């Protein structure tokens, strides 16, 4: 629901969400090939 939302918020007032007390599955993000600008630092996508 965060990623495939109905509509995102405006860029100047962006959609803000807090994630805690959760078993966050990053594997669903990792396996998806629709992403074309997977640019991050500090952590590898496979070791995330």
């Amino acid at each position, epitope marked *: 629901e965060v990623f495939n939302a109905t509509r995102f918020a405006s860029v100047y007032a962006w959609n803000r969400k807090r994630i805690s007390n959760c078993v966050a599955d990053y594997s669903v993000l990792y396996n998806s*090939a629709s992403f*074309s*600008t*997977f*640019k*991050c630092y*500090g952590v*590898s996508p*496979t070791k995330l």
Partner: antibody
Amino acid sequence: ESLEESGGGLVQPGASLTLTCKASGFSFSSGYYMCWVRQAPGKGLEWIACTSGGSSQYTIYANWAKGRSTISKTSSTTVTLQMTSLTAADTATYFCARGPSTYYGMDLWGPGTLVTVSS
Amino acid sequence: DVVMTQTPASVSEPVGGTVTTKCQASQNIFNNLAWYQQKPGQPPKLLISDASNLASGVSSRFTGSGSGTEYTLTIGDLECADGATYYCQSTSYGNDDGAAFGGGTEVVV
């Protein structure tokens, strides 16, 4: 802009050498990362390490040189890479290149400096 | 650190033909690829970034494609000055994946 190297040349086997890359026309901001890459005389390129610019101290090392290289930023325009226990297999040409914050390719490569590990 | 295999080691194409190079990744990189052309006695020069984007001053003959772990570099209308060595590199600088180069491929006119 321009990138230049100094501190290479002949190094005795088993010793340690220091190579410095100097920038001209810009600063080592957090939007650009330094990197070190080597080339064997008749072989291809081998990556060494990178260090994020700006106030960030984040550094990344290669698997092969994890224990034999040390990369850290000394100033916004000068920087040093130190390698220990030099062997004849380390005789290569070192290139100092910059990386944009977009995770785009290497642009504005350095001319390169040749290091020789022999007596 | 991701390891990059580039094939073929050596390729030879006539004038005006098309030469293709394949670059494979051990793990998924999500683009973040850079293609380089190096002439003897010269530092490598950038050709393609993000595996699909061409930089300024780069001819349209060079074309990048592929995604996931398989990538392709295509050079059309080969010229006498195109004789060089081509390399592929992941651009994961602070991602713990490293930026390890693959085996260079030389082109013969």
